[PDB]
What we know:
The structure holds 3 chains of a larger assembly.
Chain A: H1 13-23, H2 25-28, H3 36-42, H4 45-61, H5 68-86, H6 97-109, H7 118-133, H8 141-150, H9 153-156, H10 159-165, H11 167-174, H12 179-182, H13 189-200, H14 210-222, H15 232-245, H16 253-266, H17 277-285, E1 288-291, E2 296-300, H18 305-325, E3 341-346, H19 349-360, E4 369-371, E5 383-393, E6 398-399, H20 401-413, H21 427-439, H22 444-451, H23 458-462, H24 471-488, H25 490-500, H26 505-518, H27 520-532
Parallel strand pairs in A: 2-3, 3-5
Antiparallel strand pairs in A: 1-2, 4-5, 5-6
Helix pairs in contact in A: 1-5, 4-5, 4-6, 5-7, 6-7, 7-10, 7-11, 8-13, 13-14, 13-15, 14-16, 18-20, 20-21, 21-24, 22-24, 22-27, 24-25, 25-26
Chain B: no helix or strand
The complex binds calcium ion (CA) (4 copies) and zinc ion.
One calcium ion is lined by residues 302-303, 347, 388 of chain A.
Enzyme class (chain A): hydrolase
EC number (chain A): 3.4.24.3
Keywords (chain A): Calcium, Hydrolase, Metal-binding, Metalloprotease, Protease, Secreted, Signal, Zinc, Zymogen
Amino acid sequence: EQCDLSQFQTTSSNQLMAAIRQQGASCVNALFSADTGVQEAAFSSNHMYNVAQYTRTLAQQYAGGGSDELEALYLYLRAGYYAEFYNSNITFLSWVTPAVKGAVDAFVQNAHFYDNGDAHGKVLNEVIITMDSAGLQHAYLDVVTQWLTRWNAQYAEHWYMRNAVNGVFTLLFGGQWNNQYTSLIGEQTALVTALQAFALDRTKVNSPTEFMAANAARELGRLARYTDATIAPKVTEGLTAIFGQYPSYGDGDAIWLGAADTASYYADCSQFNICGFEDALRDAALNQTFICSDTIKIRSQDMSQAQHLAACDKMAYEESFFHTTLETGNQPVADDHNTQLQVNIFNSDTDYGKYAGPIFGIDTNNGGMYLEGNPANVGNIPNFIAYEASYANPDHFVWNLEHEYVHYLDGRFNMYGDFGTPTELVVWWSEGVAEYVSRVNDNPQAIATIQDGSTYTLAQVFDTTYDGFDVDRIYRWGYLAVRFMFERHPDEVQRMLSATRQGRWAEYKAIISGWANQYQSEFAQWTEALAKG
Amino acid sequence: GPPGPP
Amino acid sequence: GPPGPP
Ligand SMILES: [Ca+2]
Ligand SMILES: [Ca+2]
Ligand SMILES: [Ca+2]
Ligand SMILES: [Ca+2]
Ligand SMILES: [Zn+2]
């Protein structure tokens, strides 16, 4: 009825398996992040060996139709490899993995391994993933080649099958760190053939399985690093077919770009005559143009006129609001000619993740990005990149439109030099001022993070970095610190800005470290008031 | 590292 | 950095 995580904290392998088969896969989930007393008990090397041997003989008895118990057993096992990797108190002995390989082999060798079906796919998913969690990528290239070859439109009807068989591409990815795999991958001509045919199947384009077509292309592009291996011609031949059959922009461009991403990195674009595809891609994808003013230009994939106007008018509103809140006098920092901004807006986060990478050379694991360029360079035009979203602000519906735009303003009027210039951490200020100016006092998550019991001090906020991308610490606590300082110490803010507007990062760090000593009392009190009313 | 939970 | 996982 309910998950009893304590039942897994035992020395009895029998009782551990009773907990797995009774509590089911949804409760085994808790073992991934359980207290290390739970993990150390539940993932002893004996436990893994005994659970593996019972899993193996149970899987020999499998008769199709899915299996809640095998689903939970392979989940438990791969949860162990997760626990071994992240918990230092857990090391598996030499004889654990060959038992796990025996359990996995029993499912692979069973007559029902290539069955179609939702329930069967749910257990198959755990098996495919365990092949990866457990460092066995070198042992099952034959299964990858088989799934690529058998996959058809009937298997594709089932979410869980798509989800399970998509795992073989993660197996090819993870084998990079497996020496038996790298010592072996170079002779797998059957696999390369199958990756090619799978990717090149046009019926996948605009289907629910187009992402699998794209993952096949991406992992084939990885194989182009093995420049002298026996597969090199068929990898190359197959990548050239992908590049020739699908467009760089349009229906199926996910497959073209998947291959281009990895083949460009691990090889050379000139091997495939795709060098410099990024320019034509930029024109095709951001094919609209809309001039707000002589200082702001939008390039967009697909916006209505009503959106363009709303975005232009919203940026003009935020501009004058920025300059009075920051007391700039409309005077830029020295050596900054960034008078003109270019705004680049894709139709969705999906498109952004496909196109902004190759076009602007950024990482897209985020909600937008600002690129200052070199402000001292005459003619430099900075860019920010964003995407439309239904949760974005009307009437423009561009996610983070005002956030990224405050980055442009902040970089030109508060922060001397280009983006890398500072020699001290400014993450809290850049993201804080961008959140505070665009949202003012409307930030329910920043309020939320005060009430949940976990808070940060001023000292801790100021030393925040982008490492790990702690969105809560970066943007919400960046927001609170900037807001607090503006409400209760706008004099002090101008002194800090006097340093950053001139690039005195040592004096700036000196200023804010003072704040973190004195005002910690004020701040702690001031944030509790926000949690009150 | 190893794949997280589903 | 290098290209990420599927
Ligand atoms: Ca360990
Ligand atoms: Ca649109
Ligand atoms: Ca600057
Ligand atoms: Ca919190
Ligand atoms: Zn930002």
